[PDB]
Symmetry: C3
Subunit: 90 residues, 3 copies
């Protein structure tokens, strides 16, 4: 009966990304040090998790969006979201 | 029908914080290397997520507490919890 | 009505671990840079969260598995999963 969130952060400013699953859709709010704003992530899902890592100064984000028993991985690597290779079996 | 948790950690000892949403309330358990104990975080919420980052040796924690469609951000920056600026729109 | 996931990552390749709670059981999918595969974690739980940290190059993972109001901590420290000391009270 409530939305479900997932959060990641990087750097020292820092950058924060908060993903919210709400009525089957996942959206993204962003902080880069001076105000929250809406990010470019908008994908179907009833459940979300997230992890991220740096390579040097370059951020890489992985968002795991689940509907039913199907989890779709979404990838940010500095220049657009792409579908990742994650599968739950095989 | 089960509680919902979120976890973060920092350092090498390490420090761990585990947040549990239970019957609309979020509480905090803490590990600083030698035993679990109850933390000072106690706020309403049906869902919780968390992220944290270091600036030097200084930890900063952000806990996202959601009830219905409203997410409240709680901030630890070394000396007490404060409400953060996060909003889901505007 | 959907599975619930939790994700962690470490290093630069990176390593990713994704935990899925599905019908009361938590399983693990792994990425070490070249293909997803099934990990050795398989434990009861309706809800999962995870955190991890490095000591030097050595990864340490903590998975928090909850059923009802009982959260069990599972520990990876390079050579097998063990039950952790976490308790929600006392
Ligand atoms: O500056 C915001 C942004 O570009 O940051 C990286 C990702 O979080 C994107 O979805 C997002 O739109
Ligand atoms: O470059 C994207 C990718 O290779 O990154 C590592 C993992 O997240 C993979 O599933 C994903 O396809
Ligand atoms: O030592 C425990 C503590 O001070 O650590 C930082 C935050 O997790 C606080 O809520 C918590 O009470
Ligand atoms: O100092 C607190 C604060 O500015 O930290 C960064 C973000 O978490 C903000 O929403 C929050 O208000
Ligand atoms: O290489 C996979 C593996 O050994 O990595 C560390 C842990 O995630 C284990 O459960 C997992 O089987
Ligand atoms: O070595 C395992 C252990 O001591 O690691 C730190 C915490 O996760 C504890 O609950 C856990 O028992």
């Amino acid at each position: 009966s409530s939305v479900q969130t997932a959060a990641t952060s990087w750097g020292t400013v820092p950058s924060i990304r908060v993903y919210t699953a709400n009525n089957g859709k996942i959206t993204e709010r962003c902080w880069n040090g001076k105000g929250w704003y809406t990010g470019a992530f908008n994908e179907p899902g009833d459940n979300v998790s997230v992890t991220s890592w740096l390579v040097g100064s370059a951020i890489h984000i992985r968002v795991y969006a689940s509907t039913g028993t199907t989890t779709t991985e979404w990838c940010w690597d500095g220049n657009g979201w792409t579908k990742g290779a994650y599968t739950a079996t095989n």
